[PDB]
């Protein structure tokens, strides 16, 4: 599962991002919407135009949640389960979509902090992203 060596890696890169959680959050989301346009279909009520501020504060929530799972990285599923209901049941979000956001998070991590997405880091990071994807897709499996 998430080994000890993963959980440092993750912890470490999060320590290094932290500050920027709102900017990264929003570039994450913007890039997902230009790159994976079917993804907009779920935010039918957003101002999806560049800069918008719903994006800005949605992308704050997104990565704050992630930041959060990082501090209780020992029990992600417990920590995040409040978000499944909503994602799995309510929004019914296609699991594909989590790889997608996840990929765009890694791209934002890489443009700003490439020296830290070392390949060994990248891997801890993807394991963690899957774990999250898995818990929000939860009460399917």
């Amino acid at each position: 599962v998430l080994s000890a060596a993963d959980k440092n890696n993750v912890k470490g890169i999060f320590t290094k991002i932290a500050g920027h959680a709102e900017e990264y959050g929003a570039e994450t989301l913007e890039r997902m919407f230009i790159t994976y346009p079917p993804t907009k279909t779920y935010f039918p009520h957003f101002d999806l135009s560049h800069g918008s501020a719903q994006i800005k504060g949605h992308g704050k929530k997104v990565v704050a949640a992630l930041i959060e799972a990082a501090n209780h990285i020992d029990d992600i599923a417990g920590t995040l389960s409040k978000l499944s209901d909503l994602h799995a049941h309510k929004l019914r979000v296609d699991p594909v979509n989590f790889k997608l956001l996840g990929q765009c998070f890694l791209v934002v991590v890489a443009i700003h902090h490439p020296a830290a997405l070392t390949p060994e880091v990248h891997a801890s990071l993807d394991k963690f992203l899957c774990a999250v994807g898995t818990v929000l897709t939860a009460k399917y499996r």
Binding site: R31, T35, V107, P114, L117, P119, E120, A123
Partner: protein, 146 residues
């Protein structure tokens, strides 16, 4: 597949500053490390026992360059990606028996690697251009099934 002109130019300019060898070794090292099962296809390469072994390995580096180079053939030929990869596809499907999900995986990694060497220069329009390029190459390779 239909190529916008704004898109041709975004794939074309980026391409022209890629160090093929630098991104190659890197794309491929990351594919071995991040998705460790791909190691199996590459075992002829010698020691892949640890991450360090892997970025240590000459063949890994050397074959990375070869790959990225083959991306070049598509960037040279955006209107004919279909036939550029047609011999590469026989090898990948027939001979080596790679599951096409893996090409998706390397195209995604490729993009993480281009992100990281080009920074703000790897623009949202620009990433969308590249994600479509690697999407395409992959289907180009995956033809040989269905």
């Amino acid at each position: 597949v239909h190529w916008s002109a704004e898109e041709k130019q975004l794939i074309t300019g980026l391409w022209g500053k890629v160090n093929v060898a630098d991104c190659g070794a890197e794309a491929l090292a990351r594919l071995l490390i991040v998705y460790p099962w791909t190691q199996r296809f590459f075992a002829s390469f010698g020691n892949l026992s640890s991450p360090t072994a892997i970025l240590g390995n000459p063949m890994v580096r050397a074959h990375g360059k070869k790959v990225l180079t083959s991306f070049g053939d598509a960037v040279k030929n955006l209107d004919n990606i279909k036939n550029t990869f047609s011999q590469l596809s026989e090898l990948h499907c027939d001979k080596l028996h790679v599951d096409p999900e893996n090409f998706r995986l390397l195209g995604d990694i490729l993009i993480i690697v281009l992100a990281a060497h080009f920074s703000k220069d790897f623009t949202p329009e620009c990433q969308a251009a590249w994600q479509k390029l690697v999407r395409v190459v992959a289907h180009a390779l995956a033809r040989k099934y269905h």
